[PDB]
Amino acid sequence: PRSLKKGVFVDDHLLEKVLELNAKGEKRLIKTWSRRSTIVPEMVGHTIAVYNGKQHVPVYITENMVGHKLGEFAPTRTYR
Amino acid sequence: EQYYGTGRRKEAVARVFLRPGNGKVTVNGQDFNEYFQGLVRAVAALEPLRAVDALGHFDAYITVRGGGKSGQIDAIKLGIARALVQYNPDYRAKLKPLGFLTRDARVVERKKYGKHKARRAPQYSKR
Amino acid sequence: ARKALIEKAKRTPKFKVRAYTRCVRCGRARSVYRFFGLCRICLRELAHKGQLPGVRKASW
Amino acid sequence: KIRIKLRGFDHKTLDASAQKIVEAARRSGAQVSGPIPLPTRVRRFTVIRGPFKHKDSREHFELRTHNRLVDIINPNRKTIEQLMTLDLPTGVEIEIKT
Amino acid sequence: ARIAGVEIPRNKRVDVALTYIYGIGKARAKEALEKTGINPATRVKDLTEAEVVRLREYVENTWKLEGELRAEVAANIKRLMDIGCYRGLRHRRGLPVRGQRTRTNARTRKGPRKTVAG
Amino acid sequence: GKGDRRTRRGKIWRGTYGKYRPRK
Amino acid sequence: ARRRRAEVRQLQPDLVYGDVLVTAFINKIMRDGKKNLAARIFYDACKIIQEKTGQEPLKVFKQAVENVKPRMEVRSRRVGGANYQVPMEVSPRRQQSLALRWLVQAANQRPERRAAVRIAHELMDAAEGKGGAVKKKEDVERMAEANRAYAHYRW
RNA sequence: CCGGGCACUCUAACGGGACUGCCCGCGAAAGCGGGAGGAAGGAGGGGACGACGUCUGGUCAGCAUGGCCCUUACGGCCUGGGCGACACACGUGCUACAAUGCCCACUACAAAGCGAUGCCACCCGGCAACGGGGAGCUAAUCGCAAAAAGGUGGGCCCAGUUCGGAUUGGGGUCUGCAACCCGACCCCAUGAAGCCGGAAUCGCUAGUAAUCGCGGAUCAGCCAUGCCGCGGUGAAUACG
Ligand SMILES: [Mg+2]
Ligand SMILES: [Mg+2]
Ligand SMILES: [Mg+2]
Ligand SMILES: [Mg+2]
Ligand SMILES: [Mg+2]
Ligand SMILES: [Mg+2]
Ligand SMILES: [Mg+2]
Ligand SMILES: [Mg+2]
Ligand SMILES: [Mg+2]
Ligand SMILES: [Mg+2]
Ligand SMILES: [Mg+2]
Ligand SMILES: [Mg+2]
Ligand SMILES: [Mg+2]
Ligand SMILES: [Mg+2]
Ligand SMILES: [Mg+2]
Ligand SMILES: [Mg+2]
Ligand SMILES: [Mg+2]
Ligand SMILES: [Mg+2]
Ligand SMILES: [Mg+2]
Ligand SMILES: [Mg+2]
Ligand SMILES: [Mg+2]
Ligand SMILES: [Mg+2]
Ligand SMILES: [Mg+2]
Ligand SMILES: [Mg+2]
Ligand SMILES: [Mg+2]
Ligand SMILES: [Mg+2]
Ligand SMILES: [Mg+2]
Ligand SMILES: [Mg+2]
Ligand SMILES: [Zn+2]
């Protein structure tokens, strides 16, 4: 049960950044504070540091995880 | 020719129109028993006519609006007795020992701040 | 509250969702009745004073 | 058709306003239907009595909007003659539709 | 009367005896009794094999069902669990997922109360 | 009961509509 | 009731038998404020008792209530440390409340499926001198005459 | 619905009406007991109303405010995170463990409120949440709206179930820049604990308790089972 219904939303911050990194070949880590966004197929293979609020965590993005949002891979709390 | 009383109970009114007839009662363009009857208390409305043995004398047409049906019955009981007294004011001494001509002044007690339902207090612990 | 947090007045909020009530008299954030524009406390204080027309005591 | 909508927070300002209108329109117009009273819109507000709880001590207030209707039937001039600006009441408010 | 993979409801109404199938609730049973043209009220013991063979035809291959469902669910967990998904982390540590509170009343998802001292 | 949302009663308890409690 | 005697509620006569004891019994059956359902239970039980037995349900209801009325019961009284189970009589008003409540609470302990069946069966047994309700009555009067040694504490 | 009418119900303003005033008994009196008349009686029922003061009670985080600290910072802007963490413990509630019940169809009787970009009849699509279209209403005139328990008919037949709706997989609507932490709602599948609760303990004396729905304030949305109001059915018991 999850819903965006159309125009599957992704922030304009990284979008214009990543599509330009393809035309020049895969780049190294990337800084991202917008985990609001969904994942689209053209991210597969990249590396993206998502903010948990304190640090930037490197996240290798693969084929299986195309549907979700960033931050599903950058948890916030720390327990035990 | 015709005699009338109003009757009221618990935010419910039902105007009783009495006419000499076979004994058939209409309520809101429906048969008396097609409106009630599924409700055991229904006969109470008609007790004023058994106290004066007015069963087979009168027809009645009623208009019942407001409240719930069980209060609708009590208002009909009064309105029947009210029309009965205006008919023969000597029926006051007959109907009064039964109280059929008294209005039931009990209405839903208003809910009050701090409680749940107007009397029921929230349960506490102290520990 | 703080004078800085009366920035809602100047909103141009860049997102409508960021508009919030902000009782005008006392600058209360939380409990702001909308029809008067005051907070629950400023509402009682102005009602007793008699500066809110038509607003009486409630009894029934 | 002449509709006149009287609305006010005080129930004595409407009555002070409505009676004055029937007396100016009954010297000219036909039997004015009458000061027919429309139900009241009661806005209620319940507020905790103090700041910073004692949740269970609230006192409520109410603001009541009283309503009245007029309906002069076939008024022509000596009705509208006394109706331009002679009224005293202040908390009253009036609308007209035809 | 075995409709799905080995599944034998009996002696009750047919619609309700289908609830006893894994991939079948009341919505799927009423739908199969509708689309196969069977009275839902008939007792299971009174079911025609011609009706029963029509029912097996429908239900077996219309929806993914009992055996495959359990594997499909688990493989749908490992899926989000093998990736670093947050939703998968909650499945590991045995905690609620849909975004409930754990400070109290996590009892159903997790390990009926295991108490410590103070 | 009032808890089952796929019954008519559990639909009126939440104050919603659906297949198990249509409008008209 | 510290001040007054707290007079008795006067019940309305039965709509059918004109009998107040009927209404009082119907009320003990009524739960959640459903008097309508409670009557249809009682009256549909009156048909069970009058068919399965060729006798007037009026006189059986009376006869059942009478056989469950306790003449004595036991009460506690704080005396010299721990209290004591003290026997004493039962005012005729309390004989009413107990016997009526006992019939109803017994019938719901019965095996029968539908409500009116349990009532009519319990009633039928109760008039006959058996059934769970008459055991509560026969067990109470057993508390007295057992602690009879404290009959001097009457209060 | 029209013609038409204000009588009735109603609506909302002004009044009348109950005073131990009348009768019996007691009493020095105040008053107590009982009775008629009466819609109503000994404070008819319910509110608003809370004395001199107490607890160094509560709040300088609503506001005000004395003193004291902070002043590229205790202040100011933003994005992201947190106020939602979970091995446990208490409080308060909600839903239940069922047959006086659950489910389905049919059908009936409320009071009080809210609504101008809002309430949205009605038509079409969609199993549905909902979308398109679009009427009426500045609202006793239109809309929320269907009240639910109830009644009639039918299904389940005592079983972890046609009880119970937790958890979880999967598909989707809407609000919103944005629903990962973190929303509600819909549809499919899943169908847990729970068979009246130890010591202990809470509420209520009559339209009360119990039970059943309805609305509103804040709010785009909503974790409202909270809260503040509304009426529907309608008890048990008080020796003391
Ligand atoms: Mg730890
Ligand atoms: Mg109530
Ligand atoms: Mg509380
Ligand atoms: Mg407290
Ligand atoms: Mg300040
Ligand atoms: Mg906001
Ligand atoms: Mg509070
Ligand atoms: Mg476990
Ligand atoms: Mg375990
Ligand atoms: Mg274990
Ligand atoms: Mg310590
Ligand atoms: Mg259910
Ligand atoms: Mg009084
Ligand atoms: Mg008073
Ligand atoms: Mg202190
Ligand atoms: Mg908190
Ligand atoms: Mg359709
Ligand atoms: Mg009008
Ligand atoms: Mg009209
Ligand atoms: Mg009008
Ligand atoms: Mg039936
Ligand atoms: Mg179990
Ligand atoms: Mg089940
Ligand atoms: Mg069982
Ligand atoms: Mg009291
Ligand atoms: Mg809302
Ligand atoms: Mg939640
Ligand atoms: Mg609500
Ligand atoms: Zn304020």
Side-chain angles (χ1 to χ4, degrees), chain A, chain B, chain C, chain D residues 1-97, chain E, chain F, chain G:
Chain A
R2 50 179 70 182
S3 49
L4 329 180
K5 323 140 255 181
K6 78 190 49 70
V8 169
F9 193 87
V10 179
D11 288 30
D12 312 18
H13 317 147
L14 25 68
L15 203 55
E16 72 173 318
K17 186 174 302 179
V18 59
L19 66 90
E20 292 177 327
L21 294 181
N22 298 350
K24 282 73 205 168
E26 312 260 19
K27 201 207 174 186
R28 276 60 221 154
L29 312 176
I30 247 65
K31 55 167 69 180
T32 289
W33 290 267
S34 65
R35 25 199 283 170
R36 308 300 182 178
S37 35
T38 341
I39 298 174
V40 296
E42 47 272 40
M43 305 170 176
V44 180
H46 287 285
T47 0
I48 294 123
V50 192
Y51 206 46
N52 42 82
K54 177 183 177 310
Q55 300 182 57
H56 273 346
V57 282
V59 191
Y60 191 20
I61 153 85
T62 338
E63 171 67 27
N64 35 53
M65 48 189 64
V66 171
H68 309 283
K69 320 250 183 191
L70 316 101
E72 300 212 54
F73 306 79
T76 287
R77 285 80 180 244
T78 8
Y79 171 55
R80 147 211 170 273
Chain B
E1 191 275 301
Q2 190 177 196
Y3 304 93
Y4 173 83
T6 301
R8 251 186 299 270
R9 164 61 175 269
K10 191 182 185 182
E11 227 100 27
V13 344
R15 3 146 136 180
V16 168
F17 295 74
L18 284 185
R19 294 110 147 183
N22 179 276
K24 304 187 174 183
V25 192
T26 299
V27 166
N28 302 20
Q30 272 190 298
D31 197 307
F32 180 84
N33 329 284
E34 283 167 350
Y35 189 100
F36 300 137
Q37 188 33 57
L39 329 163
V40 177
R41 280 219 330 107
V43 205
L46 324 175
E47 264 288 344
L49 304 181
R50 235 163 337 179
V52 294
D53 218 317
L55 319 175
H57 292 355
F58 297 90
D59 283 344
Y61 169 41
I62 318 180
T63 303
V64 202
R65 48 219 302 161
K69 289 190 174 186
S70 183
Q72 292 193 162
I73 290 172
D74 295 321
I76 293 174
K77 175 189 299 175
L78 220 210
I80 282 178
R82 286 182 151 196
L84 217 43
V85 153
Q86 188 202 339
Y87 170 83
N88 192 11
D90 293 298
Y91 290 162
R92 300 208 64 266
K94 317 289 184 180
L95 243 42
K96 195 159 185 302
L98 303 320
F100 283 153
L101 21 74
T102 298
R103 211 273 217 203
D104 190 281
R106 308 184 281 167
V107 201
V108 158
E109 188 165 334
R110 156 233 165 162
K111 194 245 156 184
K112 293 152 197 172
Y113 69 95
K115 310 311 203 73
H116 284 297
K117 36 122 71 260
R119 297 220 170 187
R120 206 261 201 273
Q123 119 163 182
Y124 78 114
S125 67
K126 189 259 289 193
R127 221 193 317 256
Chain C
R2 332 213 296 263
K3 233 186 178 183
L5 262 295
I6 318 190
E7 70 182 338
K8 168 260 168 288
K10 56 84 162 165
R11 45 170 88 176
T12 319
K14 177 186 175 185
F15 301 119
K16 33 190 292 182
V17 289
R18 298 186 166 176
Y20 54 109
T21 19
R22 268 300 167 192
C23 163
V24 43
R25 184 193 167 208
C26 88
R28 184 63 179 285
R30 200 66 123 196
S31 175
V32 189
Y33 278 59
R34 305 172 86 232
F35 165 82
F36 301 92
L38 297 180
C39 76
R40 76 142 196 274
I41 300 164
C42 286
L43 160 54
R44 186 167 127 94
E45 297 193 354
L46 262 309
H48 292 9
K49 218 141 180 170
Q51 311 192 9
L52 310 206
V55 193
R56 337 167 65 261
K57 295 274 289 190
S59 181
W60 75 108
Chain D
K1 267 107 291 179
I2 314 87
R3 279 187 183 176
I4 306 92
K5 219 150 183 56
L6 282 147
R7 46 189 70 263
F9 297 157
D10 184 18
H11 77 88
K12 299 194 53 195
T13 295
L14 292 208
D15 297 14
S17 197
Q19 180 208 351
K20 281 192 178 73
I21 286 180
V22 182
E23 290 201 29
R26 279 195 177 280
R27 316 181 192 213
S28 29
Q31 173 219 359
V32 191
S33 282
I36 158 183
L38 289 171
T40 296
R41 291 270 205 184
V42 175
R43 286 229 217 79
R44 239 191 293 282
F45 321 92
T46 286
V47 159
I48 308 94
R49 225 181 257 269
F52 198 100
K53 58 104 185 67
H54 299 150
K55 45 160 185 174
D56 277 336
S57 74
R58 1 199 197 271
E59 147 213 36
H60 16 50
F61 314 107
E62 62 183 33
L63 169 135
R64 43 189 57 261
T65 328
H66 312 271
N67 300 288
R68 304 291 183 266
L69 228 54
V70 189
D71 268 49
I72 317 174
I73 290 177
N74 292 68
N76 18 86
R77 178 49 38 198
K78 298 87 183 66
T79 307
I80 318 185
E81 194 103 358
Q82 307 156 113
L83 270 278
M84 295 316 300
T85 309
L86 296 185
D87 91 299
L88 308 181
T90 293
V92 67
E93 197 227 65
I94 306 182
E95 307 278 49
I96 312 98
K97 200 160 184 175
Chain E
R2 162 190 285 98
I3 283 297
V6 287
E7 263 253 353
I8 314 82
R10 179 66 166 189
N11 214 355
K12 281 165 132 72
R13 300 159 104 275
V14 170
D15 57 326
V16 138
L18 297 194
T19 275
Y20 296 160
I21 315 161
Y22 191 48
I24 279 85
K26 288 294 287 195
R28 300 207 153 165
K30 181 173 185 175
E31 184 188 359
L33 273 286
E34 165 73 16
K35 287 226 167 189
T36 325
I38 307 177
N39 179 21
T42 40
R43 255 57 236 271
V44 164
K45 43 180 196 165
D46 308 320
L47 255 268
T48 301
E49 75 91 15
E51 282 180 315
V52 170
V53 74
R54 285 200 321 254
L55 236 202
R56 191 182 301 114
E57 293 326 272
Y58 192 12
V59 186
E60 282 236 34
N61 41 325
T62 172
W63 326 288
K64 43 220 174 175
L65 278 206
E66 183 131 2
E68 298 177 332
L69 262 188
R70 307 190 179 283
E72 171 174 349
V73 168
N76 244 320
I77 295 296
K78 317 263 185 184
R79 175 192 150 201
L80 44 73
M81 227 208 231
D82 286 349
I83 68 169
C85 190
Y86 168 86
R87 193 174 170 194
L89 267 197
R90 310 295 286 180
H91 277 278
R92 291 181 179 171
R93 315 177 189 186
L95 291 172
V97 169
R98 314 290 203 176
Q100 301 89 285
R101 55 142 57 185
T102 68
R103 188 187 207 174
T104 22
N105 307 336
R107 249 49 254 169
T108 270
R109 194 65 214 281
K110 164 243 293 185
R113 281 173 230 271
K114 29 200 155 70
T115 313
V116 242
Chain F
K2 301 154 195 154
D4 202 356
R5 24 205 303 197
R6 63 172 64 194
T7 73
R8 155 152 277 171
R9 181 160 297 182
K11 224 65 153 184
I12 69 192
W13 183 81
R14 290 190 168 207
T16 60
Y17 298 102
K19 184 169 71 173
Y20 301 96
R21 187 213 175 183
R23 306 209 178 192
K24 220 90 265 179
Chain G
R2 194 181 290 271
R3 297 186 163 261
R4 220 203 203 192
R5 198 71 140 277
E7 21 88 326
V8 191
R9 286 203 166 268
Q10 221 71 350
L11 304 125
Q12 287 269 340
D14 184 25
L15 309 317
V16 165
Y17 288 164
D19 182 75
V20 293
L21 181 56
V22 177
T23 303
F25 185 77
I26 302 175
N27 288 341
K28 277 295 185 191
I29 309 170
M30 155 181 42
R31 61 176 47 129
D32 305 308
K34 299 178 169 195
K35 198 144 66 68
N36 177 71
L37 164 62
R40 280 220 274 85
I41 293 181
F42 180 73
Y43 288 151
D44 279 46
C46 283
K47 321 195 192 313
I48 301 178
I49 183 173
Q50 200 271 331
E51 294 176 51
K52 207 175 299 187
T53 308
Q55 300 176 352
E56 280 194 16
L58 171 66
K59 189 205 161 296
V60 190
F61 167 79
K62 311 278 188 174
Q63 179 75 310
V65 155
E66 190 44 54
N67 297 16
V68 191
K69 271 188 173 186
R71 26 198 187 277
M72 278 171 315
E73 56 160 341
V74 143
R75 292 186 169 183
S76 298
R77 184 178 167 185
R78 236 284 193 174
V79 171
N83 348 338
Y84 274 163
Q85 297 293 75
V86 184
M88 60 187 79
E89 270 176 6
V90 185
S91 109
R93 156 65 159 171
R94 186 165 177 77
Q95 300 192 353
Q96 159 104 336
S97 299
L98 299 182
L100 274 198
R101 179 185 328 153
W102 279 342
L103 299 187
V104 190
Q105 294 175 345
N108 296 350
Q109 274 266 350
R110 249 199 185 279
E112 337 271 312
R113 292 279 167 97
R114 302 104 76 172
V117 183
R118 305 189 297 272
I119 291 252
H121 275 269
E122 179 62 78
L123 258 142
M124 283 185 296
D125 276 8
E128 282 193 318
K130 54 186 180 182
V134 195
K135 245 289 253 56
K136 298 197 181 194
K137 170 257 187 189
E138 284 171 18
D139 270 339
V140 165
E141 316 175 339
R142 282 184 179 210
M143 282 306 298
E145 323 282 18
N147 309 128
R148 227 289 245 176
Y150 308 134
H152 51 291
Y153 290 131
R154 289 307 188 194
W155 187 359

